[PDB]
Design a protein around this ligand. Sequence first.
Ligand SMILES: C=C1CC[C@H](O)C/C1=C/C=C1\CCC[C@]2(C)[C@@H]([C@H](C)CCCC(C)(C)O)CC[C@@H]12
Length: 118
Amino acid sequence: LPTAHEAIEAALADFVKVYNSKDAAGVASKYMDDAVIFPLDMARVDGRQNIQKLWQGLMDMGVSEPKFTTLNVQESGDFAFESGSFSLKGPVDIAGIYVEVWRKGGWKLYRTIANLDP
Ligand SMILES: C=C1CC[C@H](O)C/C1=C/C=C1\CCC[C@]2(C)[C@@H]([C@H](C)CCCC(C)(C)O)CC[C@@H]12
């Protein structure tokens, strides 16, 4: 049987592929339009337009090799709840942990909360 864990790993594999193609609109299309990203102790990023700008900004400054490790996923109603970790390479390691909620749009990101390691 298929698990939500496996479905979310597949969605994030595609996320990474689209990021590496420098397609920020493509990345942003994997979010709900009213999605929000809350990087702790930093400014919240609200809505798909601003989320596109975030990922575009990371592309432009040369951030590369995103890796997302899905640690736990549960499914409930139209939603998937995920714990994971992330690392990216910047011109240095950019790494941390997140929880996020996906909604069946195909799974799409709705809420992300993330912390960058101190
Ligand atoms: C360090 C840099 C590079 C230097 C910049 O000036 C500040 C900065 C921002 C990085 C961000 C902030 C927003 C949240 C981000 C983008 C994290 C994502 C939300 C991680 C979760 C990714 C996903 C798709 C699993 O949900 C990764 C890096 C974080």
